[PDB]
Amino acid sequence: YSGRDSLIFLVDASKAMFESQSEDELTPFDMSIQCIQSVYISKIISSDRDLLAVVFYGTEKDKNSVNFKNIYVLQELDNPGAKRILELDQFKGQQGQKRFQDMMGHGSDYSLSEVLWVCANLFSDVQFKMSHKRIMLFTNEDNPHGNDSAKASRARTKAGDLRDTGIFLDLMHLKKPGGFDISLFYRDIISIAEDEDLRVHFEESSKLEDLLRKVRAKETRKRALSRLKLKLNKDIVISVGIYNLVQKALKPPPIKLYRETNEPVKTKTRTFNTSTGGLLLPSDTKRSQIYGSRQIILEKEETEELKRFDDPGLMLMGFKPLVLLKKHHYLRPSLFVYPEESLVIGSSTLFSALLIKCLEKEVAALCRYTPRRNIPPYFVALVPQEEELDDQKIQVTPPGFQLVFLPFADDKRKMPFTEKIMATPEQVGKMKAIVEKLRFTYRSDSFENPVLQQHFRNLEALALDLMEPEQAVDLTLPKVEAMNKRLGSLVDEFKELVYPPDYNPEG
């Protein structure tokens, strides 16, 4: 998967889209605009290099390259930004609806062939490489051309051509007074007609709920940290790729702005001798260290040469039972090792054999790891990792090796000696009851970073000029009230059974 995702938002501007069936409900136009804004914000946070565009059809004005009638291209394909969201924000209500009607117009005829032609033309203009091409059609008219059969055939031909070119078409049908029947016309236009998506729908599509679900986490495409050589011997070498399935998420780095016009300023660091005042190149300086009441001077090149031990790669050392590995010897986040046939042919077979036999024999491959040049070696254990899939056949545990860093003698620390006081069985049983009361199922994706979420909320509020920032719910905070309710009198009994009457833990 290489390229950028391109998305075009087609929104109908017919009269039927501007009527509210119930007093307390959203018109189709308002729902469409809300969805567009939500997708824009999600894209800004997640993938900022993707291309989005917004088009309207059924209007009185026209703005397009082909000079077609009744098609207004509001925003051509470009990366998302705050200005575009603000531009869309002036159609978000009833006054916004009046503003939209005044600016463009509504209630005019149209041809779907021309609309799809304009969308394809927009796709053609893009000069980058697009991995996906998608159009979403927001409408509530199941039979756009019931009077004219020729227009329907033209639309079918254009949809077929677009599908051939590699453009996905999706229908996001909104609520209709009489109900939406995809069976009438939109079966041929739609890219994929699901078996369940054939009955008449009396409510908006289930895709709107997913669109309105804001995603506020960066999505990074697959990428290999390094391509290394695993050396079983001086002659047997295979090529492997190293990946990181867990990486800490950090706030985007701040940029320095000039206050009077908000234009970026570039910074530069230079070193100049106190006496002469002139600049000193890096070649006109040395390095020093004090030890034993003396000064030891070394050049920079030697300072870097001190770190050179062996060439980049993994060197096999032997095989170790998995029992000898320890869970409390964690040192650094683990990595993933997978085969790579691009550099050496036949690596996949040997890697598969090693994985299978390591799983059968319950062993881990001990190795010496040197990621880059001028990096002292570390010791790693490659633990086999079988393939595990969930119910829906979506792979959840990939096959390969897990690279775990092992500590050196210097990385451990000495603990103060503490006398052991064991607990009588009754205390252990009471605490077992307490533990059992508060049992729950844990998943790796059950928590969110409060700091990053608040940062993104604040940034969005500042950018879009909202009244107040949205406040994120912190799921890491304990639920004290629920725990107190569940435990009941267990806490009091345990405290009576384990703490003297006059202890005062707080003091």
């Binding site: 997708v39 669109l211 995603v215 495409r221 979506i394 729950f440 928590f447 799921l475």
Partner: peptide
Amino acid sequence: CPGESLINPGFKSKKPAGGVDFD
């Protein structure tokens, strides 16, 4: 294919964070 993201193609739609849900 099933359970794919409608915003970022090629990625699976992550389930919303649920915190602690006691049994």
